Amino acid sequence: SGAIYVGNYRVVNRHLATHNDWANLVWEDSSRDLLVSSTTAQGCDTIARCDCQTGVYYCSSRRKHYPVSFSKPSLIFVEASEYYPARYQSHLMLAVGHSEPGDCGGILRCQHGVVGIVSTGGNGLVGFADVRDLLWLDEE
């Protein structure tokens, strides 16, 4: 679990969105595994606006933040799951890293701010949903 809190927005994995998230929906995209809802209180996270390919992510199944090198946002095949069928997840970045169902939500960040959230994983893999192209998170 986990979310990004920027301005009056809450960014979560679409597959983990609550009823309150759907009832206060701003935007959602199943191909990216992202959903944004509105919040009453202002958040403290800042979004990175950069092309970093190195950063650090939080892994709840290890209670640890790990430094990682990650690929550029791309269209990557994701294995069937209890959440989406075999499909191309878009705007996804991969890294070698520990991951477990439970971990989606964790923030990946660089020196500039939040880069994205844990969305997929593998045997020694973890995938990240990029948010750096969502410029509207910084306003309104």
Ligand X SMILES: COc1cc(Br)c(CC(=O)N2CCC[C@H](C(N)=O)C2)cc1OC
Reply yes or no on whether 91 is catalytic: no
Rounded to a whole number, what is the largest CA-CA distance in the chain?
Answer: 40
**112 interacts with, out of Zn ion, ligand X, none, CB within 5 to 8 A per kind:** Zn ion
33 is catalytic: yes
Partner from Zn ion, ligand X, none contacting 52, C-beta within 5 to 8 A by type: Zn ion
- Is there a binding annotation on residue 59? no
Q: Residue 85 is which amino acid?
A: P
Q: Is 52 annotated as a binding residue?
A: yes
In this structure, the dihedral spanned by the alpha carbons of residues 76, 82, 85 and 89, taken in order and rounded to 10 degrees, is -20
**50 appears as a binding residue in the annotation:** yes
Report CA dihedral (90, 96, 86, 130) to the nearest 10 degrees.
-20
Shortest spacing between CB 56 and Zn ion, in angstroms: 11
Compute the least distance from the CB of residue 78 to ligand X, in Å. 4
Q: 87: burial class by Cβ within 10 Å (0-12, 13-18, 19+)?
A: middle
Instruction: Identify which of residues 37 and 99 has a Cβ nearer to ligand X in the complex.
Output: 99
- State which amino acid sits at residue 12: V
Numbered residues of the known binding site for Zn(2+): 50, 52, 110, 112
Just list the catalytic residues. 15, 33, 104
